[PDB]
Amino acid sequence: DIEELETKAVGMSNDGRFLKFDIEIGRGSFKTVYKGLDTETTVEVAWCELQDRKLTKSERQRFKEEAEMLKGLQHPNIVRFYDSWESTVKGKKCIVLVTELMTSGTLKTYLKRFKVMKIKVLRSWCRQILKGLQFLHTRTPPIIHRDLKCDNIFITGPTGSVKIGDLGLATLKRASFAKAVIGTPEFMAPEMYEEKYDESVDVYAFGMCMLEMATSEYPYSECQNAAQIYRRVTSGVKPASFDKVAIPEVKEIIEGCIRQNKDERYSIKDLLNHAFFQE
Numbered sequence: 001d002i003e004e005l006e007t008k009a010v011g012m013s014n015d016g017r018f019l020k021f022d023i024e025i026g027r028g029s030f031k032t033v034y035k036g037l038d039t040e041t042t043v044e045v046a047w048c049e050l051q052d053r054k055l056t057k058s059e060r061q062r063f064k065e066e067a068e069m070l071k072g073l074q075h076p077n078i079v080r081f082y083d084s085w086e087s088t089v090k091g092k093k094c095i096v097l098v099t100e101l102m103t104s105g106t107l108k109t110y111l112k113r114f115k116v117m118k119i120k121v122l123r124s125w126c127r128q129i130l131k132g133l134q135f136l137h138t139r140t141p142p143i144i145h146r147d148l149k150c151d152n153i154f155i156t157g158p159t160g161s162v163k164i165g166d167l168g169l170a171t172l173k174r175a176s177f178a179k180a181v182i183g184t185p186e187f188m189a190p191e192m193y194e195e196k197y198d199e200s201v202d203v204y205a206f207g208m209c210m211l212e213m214a215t216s217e218y219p220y221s222e223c224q225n226a227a228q229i230y231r232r233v234t235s236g237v238k239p240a241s242f243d244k245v246a247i248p249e250v251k252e253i254i255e256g257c258i259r260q261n262k263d264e265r266y267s268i269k270d271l272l273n274h275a276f277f278q279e
């Protein structure tokens, strides 16, 4: 039986396999994450509650389909996905995901704490992300992340590896939607503003992640809103921070990755083959 010495169980999956605990693990955007338990296995999981929002019919179906496909997936540099379903308690409805639990939190958090990365760490972590992306891209059908950022790359441990999270949630990003000016303005790949993407959207995102890691700032901080950024991205204007990359080989890789024309970008295969990533 579950002892509730400090923490009460406050929710369950339909079959009661998964339990939610009233310990919040983290908050970001349109989700809160709780400590959970897989009672089959006695293994702690993340109980992620996505903000109550009305989804369109298409969004609901895209998501349930993509979720299914995540279910079996196991790779060192991917955060495992277990299940998801609609949930309510009192007056609040939400989507729950149960996933592997990453208690060391995000790359973003780390980069906020440690503003100078060692080349060795940048090399090894960027490589892991690429292995992750390559695993996704080679599923059947291929899984494209579509919203990769430091905010959804997770560290296993201060000296551990990284794992890509946020799998499948891009389906609920309203990339083509008008949106409120709040928080730091975001960019995306040129073609992604109109959702005409393929695997190369992840390459662009990867390059921007690498840039952020190398410079320790979010690209395009010189812009006040996402409209300004849009105009730059879709006109080939790089973020100021590009010019602050100290190390020639890193700058080259980033440059290969963040090209305006998606067809001109490095492939993942290229990148894993590159001297920089070949020790």
Ligand SMILES: COc1ccc(OC)c2[nH]c(=O)c(CCNC(=O)c3ccccc3I)cc12
Pocket: 025, 026, 027, 028, 031, 032, 033, 046, 048, 070, 079, 080, 081, 097, 099, 100, 101, 102, 103, 104, 105, 106, 152, 164, 165, 166, 167, 168
């Ligand atoms: C969401 O915000 C946080 C803030 C802080 C965290 O740790 C301090 C988090 N740890 C997690 O395991 C998680 C959940 C990780 N799981 C995933 O990202 C994931 C993986 C596959 C499919 C879907 C997903 I919301 C979130 C988290």
